[PDB]
Amino acid sequence: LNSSITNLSGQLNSLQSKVNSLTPLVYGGIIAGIIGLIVAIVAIVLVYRKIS
Amino acid sequence: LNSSITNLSGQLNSLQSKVNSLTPLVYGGIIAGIIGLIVAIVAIVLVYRKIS
């Protein structure tokens, strides 16, 4: 049982490590999709005002 | 073995808050990035359309 729990705590620790190595990666990654949305939007706007 | 179980549960609960604050936010980030990509691709065509 003891071996079972030790390895188990171990896997949790480990998956928190995947998610916390992921933490700055997924934030930067959100931050690139959101600037993409806004920079795309401000460029469409500026082309759309002069075609219309 | 008891104290280790209570700590496992604690750490699990922490990490479940973490990933449940991730999964919507990361979806929203991904939604914003694909939409930004739509807007940008449609901007490409409209600058291409208006020079022609």
Author numbering:
A (entry chain X), B (entry chain B): 424 to 475
Authors' account:
By combining SPA and STA with structural predictions, we built a complete S. acidocaldarius S-layer model. To get a handle on the structure of the entire S-layer, we used Alphafold v2.2.0 and SymmDock and predicted the monomeric and trimeric SlaB structure. The Alphafold predictions of the SlaB trimer superimposed remarkably well into the corresponding densities visible in our STA map at low threshold values, and flexible fitting using Namdinator further improved the fit. In the assembled lattice, SlaB trimers occupy alternating triangular pores around each hexagonal pore. The SlaB trimer has a tripod-like structure, with its long axis perpendicular to the planes formed by the membrane and SlaA. Three Ig-like domains branch away from the trimer’s symmetry axis and face the SlaA canopy, whereas three α-helices form a coiled coil, which at the predicted transmembrane region insert into the resolved exosome membrane. The lattice is a ~35-nm-thick macromolecular assembly, in which each SlaB trimer interacts with three SlaA dimers. This interaction may be mediated by the positively charged D6 dimerising domains of SlaA and the negatively charged N-terminal Ig-like D3 domains of SlaB. The new data confirm the overall p3 S-layer lattice symmetry, in which the unit cell contains one SlaB trimer and three SlaA dimers (SlaB3/3SlaA2). Because each SlaB monomer interacts with the dimerisation domains of SlaA dimers, the SlaB trimer occupancy of all triangular pores would likely be unfavourable due to steric hindrance.
